[PDB]
Amino acid sequence: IYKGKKCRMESCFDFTLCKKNGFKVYVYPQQKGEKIAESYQNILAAIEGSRFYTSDPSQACLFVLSLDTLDRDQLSPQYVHNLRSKVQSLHLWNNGRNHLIFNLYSGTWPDYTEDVGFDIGQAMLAKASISTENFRPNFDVSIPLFSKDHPRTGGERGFLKFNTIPPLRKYMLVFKGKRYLTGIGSDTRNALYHVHNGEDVVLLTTCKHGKDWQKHKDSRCDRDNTEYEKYDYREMLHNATFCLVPRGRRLGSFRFLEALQAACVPVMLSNGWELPFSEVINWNQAAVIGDERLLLQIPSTIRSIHQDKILALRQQTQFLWEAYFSSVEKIVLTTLEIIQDRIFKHISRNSLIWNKHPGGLFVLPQYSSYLGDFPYYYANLGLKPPSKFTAVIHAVVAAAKSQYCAQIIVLWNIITDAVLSLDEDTVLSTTEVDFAFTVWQSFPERIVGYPARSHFWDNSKERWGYTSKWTNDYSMVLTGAAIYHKYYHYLYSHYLPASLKNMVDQLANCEDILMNFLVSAVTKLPPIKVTDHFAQRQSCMNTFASWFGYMPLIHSQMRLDPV
Amino acid sequence: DLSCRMHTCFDVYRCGFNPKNKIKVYIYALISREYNELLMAISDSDYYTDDINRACLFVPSIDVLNQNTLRIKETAQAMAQLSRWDRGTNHLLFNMLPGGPPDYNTALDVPRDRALLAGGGFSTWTYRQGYDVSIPVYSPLSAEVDLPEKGPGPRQYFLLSSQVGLHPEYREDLEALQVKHGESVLVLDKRKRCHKHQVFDYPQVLQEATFCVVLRGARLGQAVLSDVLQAGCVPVVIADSYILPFSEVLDWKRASVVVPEEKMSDVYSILQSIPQRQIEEMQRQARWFWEAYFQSIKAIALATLQIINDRIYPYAAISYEEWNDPPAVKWGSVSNPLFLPLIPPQSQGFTAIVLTYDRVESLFRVITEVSKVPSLSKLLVVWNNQNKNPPEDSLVPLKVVRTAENKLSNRFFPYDEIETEAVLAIDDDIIMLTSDELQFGYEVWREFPDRLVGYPGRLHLWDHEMNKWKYESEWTNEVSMVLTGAAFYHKYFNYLYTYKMPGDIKNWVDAHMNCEDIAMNFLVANVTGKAVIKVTTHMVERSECINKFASVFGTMPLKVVEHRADPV
């Protein structure tokens, strides 16, 4: 009845397997004899490198296949044949009950439908280009369509280095893409010459598709081709305010991710396209959604958009790209967290966490579903930072402090939000602690501490460095005399995979470095300084950067001092 | 047709772009007082128009909300005979009882091949995602009795369940929970709620519990939800597959707790895991949701039409914060427009603006001292005197601008000649600044792009004797304002001062010739919600300015901080 195409979580899913508070995903082993694409290798590595990965099939309540399902067009070279038999012959398929199937392309040439090929059954599919009429509202996940060269880890850090007012550029609406003479889905692109204008709405098209386009060409293509080679595509997206992202053969396109990297606000024209992560992300804040049926009056609608609205849309586009779309690892983690936020619908993330800084991938609701228990959402609410802090001392002396100090915890080998981590070899006066906490009250998201160290990029060894003496700037503050949020403790314990912490334990140090890496990654802001044993730090930093994919540490040469 | 969405079965040629981005709703001319009040609320709004050829949506004058005596065939005949059916391409329908005595279909049973439905109880299977809207079910008890606006806090009971005609399984599980825990869970039996040897009044008993249980007895949507929200207790919907009303825009995760029907014996343990602060937040959110969306039929109609209008004009959709903020936190909210944590590089600089009336001998010193700093791009000088002309050919790029009128607020206009983001406003009187100080100020602004970075430090204090704010500068123990003289700030702040300034503050500062820095600080501290960074009848006028600015805003946006930034 409800177990067919109209599957939902309460019908086509086994909550009892996930009833244990242990949400884990299991990856099938490779057959070592079937071709596999690089994008699916990236997806599998993202799942396997995640904290949700487990080897034991019994413990996991989410399954992801090892067969390449991303490319499901028989005209493509990554199509895998006889996949129906290979998916029905699996021992743990179980009609695909708790199975997550990733997909990026589907459909044949005459009609690009959702021809996944094999019987999905009750499994949920994270398809790239999903029509809203064929999308399960709370079961499927709409994911972006990424390239084979899309980064596995790290990111390109966006494009918008300056936030300029007025939020306008040399052109307004831009599009340099192929127009298809024959087929399905080229109506909107072919009807762009109607609204093509001067250096305000510049819409370029190309008729050179395939090899038989000459027979089907018309008189319009001759002029278009010469004018097509006038502007560079990457440059055009950077001199533009609104980036048109119409429908080609399929609803999704690579141009959406390029519009978000370029910081231009995308104006989607694809009718009925479930936008990437639509169920958790508000797409009226980072993009303009306009029907392609009203194509002629689109530029007037774009002009009607106020400058403050444009500024908000551009910044939201930048944040959304840098949060949920920068790398395929981020996409996979976003899909997995969206899955996780449907098992226990009281320990999940609200719509404000997904659509505001730092994003849902760094806000774990298992810690708390109350926005006041996090350091990021004080201004959005009418709240103030907590006035008391818990002092945590790790002992392997003086400990003279009474003001602002609700309790002292000494660890031998927490109620308040703020946590003071102190090393027994560090002596700090109570006035200094009070000043540090007062500074922290203005910046609850960051780490406020007295010791500070910075890093450098040595070209000779192509290796990240670590300096600790007479630095002209800094990008890390040690946790030995620092104030931060207890949610950072929770995030360090329950977010980073076991390998980094294991190496930290075995090397007897490098926990503060990883803490600073984590806080700089989540906040994207530098910390604040207030006023043989040297060799392994560089290896620690290199390993951490390799795991992250980039160096989240950001330099800063300020120093907050009392007046 | 369950497959219908707004991109296939809806018509967008009929209503297109208009300067006022509001859809226009036309009402046909033909019973329940409910539908009469709904139509009257729609008519007296901004959406009602005539000239059917110009409006987009249509709301038939046929009784649809009550399905007990709906006469489904008669309703289908009426919809066909509407003479403007057009396969129901744009028509909007309202319902709150989508259930039938034989079976509860959780949706309207009329054909409605493409009609738009605003129903009360929607399942996740019978609800079109982007097409339909889930509306609250209206309980007359909301307006029949006016419960006191009791504040959040501790209550006698913890969990409560005041429903009539539940299924035996639910009641048995609730009674097991009550005998297991006791003194916190109160299951009430059959406007009067009768426990064993004790009587409670139904509207007012809900005020004594911090959690109220809403179950699925029939139609998947119960009128008890509105009463639970009105009384302030957090609703615990244990009706699985139920889409909460206005879940498209409202955040029900901060106002209610949803527990699956299977884990009903686990309800108490789940509710014990919630801290008290989130309890208070959820109670306030529930009260706000009732007073804004559930209170009257007018609120329901307005919210429904507004959601539809946002769907048809996505670029104009109202903000999430406007959707789900009580006015208290709405006034206390910030919503910083410059929220991206990006650090602009050294390639660009700052367009320095120097405002002068007279003293063209310190101004040359000012230009000489400012020009020595690196990263400076454009040294704009604004000339306000209508009488005295600037020295021509006696003065890296420099532009001198003449003002139409001599107003002090001409240093804050957004000039198109500014191609950078940082703006250094500096006056002639300030001369004890070196190049390194300005350079370090710019460096500090790089990490704090959305706040003032000013060198002078002036604060404000509260006076008990006069009960009015005062302007304090003699002693420095904390800083709440930095004067616009030698103050780095974003050009968007110039835009805000020039255009988005509430009240008559711009006119007032123009008239009084003084107090521009205080107004700038007020506006920036309100818009950004962050303090300022200091880098290391005169007084009466400043105090009067502070008091006036506090009066116009309704509060004091300034925040006291004891920290300054200095070179490492």
Ligand SMILES: CC(=O)N[C@@H]1[C@@H](O)[C@H](O[C@@H]2O[C@H](C(=O)O)[C@@H](O[C@H]3O[C@H](CO)[C@@H](O)[C@H](O)[C@H]3NC(C)=O)[C@H](O)[C@H]2O)[C@@H](CO)O[C@@H]1O
């Ligand atoms: C006269 C006539 O009807 N001709 C068509 C002919 O144009 C079709 O040929 C094309 O096949 C292309 C192909 O490479 O197989 C196909 O490109 C698509 O497939 C590649 C992978 O092979 C994908 O990477 C591309 O993204 C995808 N291109 C898109 C999205 O347009 C192209 O679409 C076809 O035009 C032929 C089928 O092969 O059918 C007739 O002969």
Ligand SMILES: *[C@@H]1O[C@H](CO)[C@@H](O[C@@H]2O[C@H](CO)[C@@H](O[C@@H]3O[C@H](CO)[C@@H](O)[C@H](O)[C@@H]3O)[C@H](O)[C@H]2NC(C)=O)[C@H](O)[C@H]1NC(C)=O
């Ligand atoms: C930034 O400025 C805006 C206005 O420009 C401030 O909003 C105002 O906030 C005050 C309270 O802080 C509101 O006063 C209240 O008015 C209601 C009636 O409207 C009254 O019943 C209350 O007792 C209270 O006096 C005022 O209405 C409100 N104005 C608007 C237009 O929203 C905002 O608070 C400022 N932000 C900061 C951080 O200072």
Ligand SMILES: O=c1ccn([C@@H]2O[C@H](COP(=O)(O)OP(=O)(O)O)[C@@H](O)[C@H]2O)c(=O)[nH]1
């Ligand atoms: O001058 C051009 C034209 C296209 N593209 C790339 O081509 C893709 C989209 O073009 P196309 O018309 O092929 O889109 P499709 O309809 O094939 O998805 C994107 O990755 C663009 O970056 C490009 O880089 N430069």
Ligand SMILES: O=c1ccn([C@@H]2O[C@H](COP(=O)(O)OP(=O)(O)O)[C@@H](O)[C@H]2O)c(=O)[nH]1
């Ligand atoms: O009619 C006038 C008088 C003064 N100013 C401006 O007022 C500032 C000087 O302020 P003031 O002399 O009060 O500074 P202070 O003496 O307090 O340091 C300069 O920038 C002038 O351009 C002005 O714009 N119009």
Ligand SMILES: *[C@@H]1O[C@H](CO)[C@@H](O)[C@H](O)[C@H]1NC(C)=O
């Ligand atoms: C678009 O911006 C880039 C900046 O990276 C600039 O080099 C280019 O010249 C601009 N385009 C045109 C047509 O000038």
